[PDB]
Design a protein around this nucleic acid. Sequence first.
RNA 1: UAAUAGCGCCGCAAUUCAUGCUGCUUGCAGCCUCUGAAUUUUGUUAAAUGAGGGUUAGUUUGACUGCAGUCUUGCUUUCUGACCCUGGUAGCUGCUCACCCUGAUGCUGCUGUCAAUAGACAGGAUAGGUGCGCUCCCAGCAAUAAGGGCGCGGAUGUACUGCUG
Lengths: 164, 601, 87
Amino acid sequence: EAPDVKPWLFLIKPYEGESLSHFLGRFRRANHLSASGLGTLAGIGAIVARWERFHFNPRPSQQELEAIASVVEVDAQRLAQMLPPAGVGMQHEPIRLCGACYAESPCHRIEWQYKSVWKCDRHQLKILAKCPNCQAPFKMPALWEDGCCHRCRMPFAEMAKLQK
Amino acid sequence: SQITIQARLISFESNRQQLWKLMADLNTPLINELLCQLGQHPDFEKWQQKGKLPSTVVSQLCQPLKTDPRFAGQPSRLYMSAIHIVDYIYKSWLAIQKRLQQQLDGKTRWLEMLNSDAELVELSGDTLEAIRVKAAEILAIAMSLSKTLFDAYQETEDIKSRSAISYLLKNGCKLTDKEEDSEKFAKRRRQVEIQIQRLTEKLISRMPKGRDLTNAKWLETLLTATTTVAEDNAQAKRWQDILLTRSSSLPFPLVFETNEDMVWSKNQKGRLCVHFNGLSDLIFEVYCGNRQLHWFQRFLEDQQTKRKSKNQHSSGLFTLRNGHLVWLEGEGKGEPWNLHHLTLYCCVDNRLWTEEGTEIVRQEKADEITKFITNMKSDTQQALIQRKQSTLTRINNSFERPSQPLYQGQSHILVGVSLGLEKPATVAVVDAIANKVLAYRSIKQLLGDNYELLNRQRRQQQYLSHERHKAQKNFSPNQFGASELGQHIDRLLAKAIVALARTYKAGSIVLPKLGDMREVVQSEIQAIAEQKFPGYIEGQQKYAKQYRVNVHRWSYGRLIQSIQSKAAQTGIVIEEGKQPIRGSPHDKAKELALSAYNLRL
Amino acid sequence: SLSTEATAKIVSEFGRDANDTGSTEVQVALLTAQINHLQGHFAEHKKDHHSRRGLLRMVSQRRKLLDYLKRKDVARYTQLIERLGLR
RNA sequence: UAAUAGCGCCGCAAUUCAUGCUGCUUGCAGCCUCUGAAUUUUGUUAAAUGAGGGUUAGUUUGACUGCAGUCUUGCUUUCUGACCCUGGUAGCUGCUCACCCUGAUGCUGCUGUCAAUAGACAGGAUAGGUGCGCUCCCAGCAAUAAGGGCGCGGAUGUACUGCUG
């Protein structure tokens, strides 16, 4: 038996605006989990493999976000801030990137998927929807392990130089 | 007891074209009188609460449309045909909506009432035995039982001790010693939630649609969608849902609810003829096989017998009851009145064929008319009582008709019929005072020479379902199925079951209270599938497709009706009972008949 | 679908340059040409279900291209709507 | 060449009784010659089922009166037979494809002759695999389930069968 340890996981702190797909992706690298493994631990089954793709066709319910909150130690009201606000239409096909800000905070911000967003206001730069050199479309944000293009291996921080 | 017989009607073009023009023009006020209720009428939600349409409202919407410039060109009987159809549309749809509302409430009760054994202990603050003791007291008070216990939970909350009344109700109105598995209870409570959800969805229904022949909405939408730009995804899809819609090709049928509004005659050539009230210029010729001709001769003999007798006999006993005149769809090219085929469908009360059967209808109507007059007892209401009393007097004067002694069966001998997925029927004939089965039949006996047709039906359903899939992927128009073969097999079994009931002089045939098996299975398989594919909704739907599909293809209501019809034409009583959950198909049939006999008192 | 000569003719008139092989002007105009040839057949051949699938796709693409152009540049959008006779 | 397996049917063989067959005890004894239920077996010039697409106001299943005599209509469907075809040019129109990998409820599969090009000619419902069929299996193709890889041009503020025909 254990000598007086408290039950634990490699918890992670969320960044100031990352998407739920990106956060779950980091959580399941801090702990080595598969997408269906994290869904099974949370008790919500195969649901997590939709959310990592932004397949929010039926939206994340209060009861499902609370189930994830019991794993990841973030309350349901802070998990809701990683999803679009009520009636803010997102798009889940083109994954998009600022890249200039990815040097200030290495994350996929949820706001880059809003249908109303076309330029990052912190930097006044046009948002990217493909790698500026090889034209490859970005992987889903849960898979942003390297923080670079998967085809030509150019860092996302260097795509700051190639945009607008 | 009623049947429908049919004949094609033949005439020269001018007559088949003039009737089409009146039906293409009549088909339109059947649309406008729907809309005058579907959105125009303010009281509509009061009707949805009551479940019934007011008996005069459609006539009061139609009366001012009789002078409409679009609708004014039609006989007084074609407006009554419009009023009839639209009355029957709404009078059906409101009665569908009301039984759904009642089911949703009647299970919303039960989703509140259904609690685990641990929840009853918490809710009572007492032992599960104290609950068993109170459940035993409640059965002692009650001895309508299941309703009385439901009412005793709806009344009589009794310091939450209605917990024990729910304990009886979940145990099937009986005491139970066993304490239940929370996983089995979770599946059980989830089935009710699924039924509740499904009912709250089905509660909303598409407001009953008219058969538009004009294509005008479709043509306007086409030229809109191809020349303009939608402002929204909702508008772009609204045009798609219109452009995908297949438009009707046939007008609504004429309905003639008064038998005398068809007039029969014999042509010079010896053929029978017919004409309709308001269309008395357009003579039509009857064409039908000699297997059905005897009714069309009887129509003319009933009419001649009344006319030869100075109207002293009543059409209250005419063999014809009502006619529906319809254009059946033809094939290939030509004008609609040259391409389609006028067909007259006659409702006939089969027991009016014989004198011994006509006497049943004489007594049935004479009792109903007498009660009507005594319930009534104003100006036109007196004129209506003149119609009724001329009937109550005239109905005693007999038509000269064929004689055949009525069938009589033994009040103790019953035929039990057991229906299922693998065995569509199986039969046990029981002498209920001997408790002795006189005979059993399985399907291989019960349709004999035809037993190859069950194997044909299963081959044809499987073969044709795959061909329809292959055809849809190619947009081929070829789409076929085993529906007429299934209808024939259900009729072969219905004749054989009643021939067997006559053979053993049975007093009745017993049919199971199957109820809505399709919805029950759909909820059970869903509550289970949610435990095996959690979150993967596509996997939940794929769980037992062939079982759910075979239950949705299960023709039990059509076999039950086929047996009812043939039994009532023979004179054998129909009775009903609970079908056993366990036992062989024979044991099911045996216990079903004995249960229906026990229910006599 | 269009003849070879008809595509070359349309791309040379809506394209900003001969090498403008796929601007929104070109794509929307080409779709408009197809749709204008398909409504004349689909209004006559009312039983031709397989062609209603083709039309409903082809109209829905035109709308996406136009919505994209509207936000990208309203002047290009306004001129294109004029030159194609749309409302 | 291949198709071993799985699943659904069809009988064939038992084995166990009855809704059956002999008795009178009108409920028992007795067996499987029939007629039927249940399980298990089988693939034997056994037997039985056996979906390439089409064709007749076809015949029989009918009414009335004492099984004989009159009258008779051509409606809507399910089978069994039989016969025919395995298509022709004249427009309109949808989808699919730069090029690759995986290969789907994907397409294709008969006999004979000539070519051995991918196609003609003459036969034909025996028509890939088994007793008979499949979304299964074998062989060929696979752009027209889907996913992934990825070249040059157009666009590149999220649109892009949007190019390579």
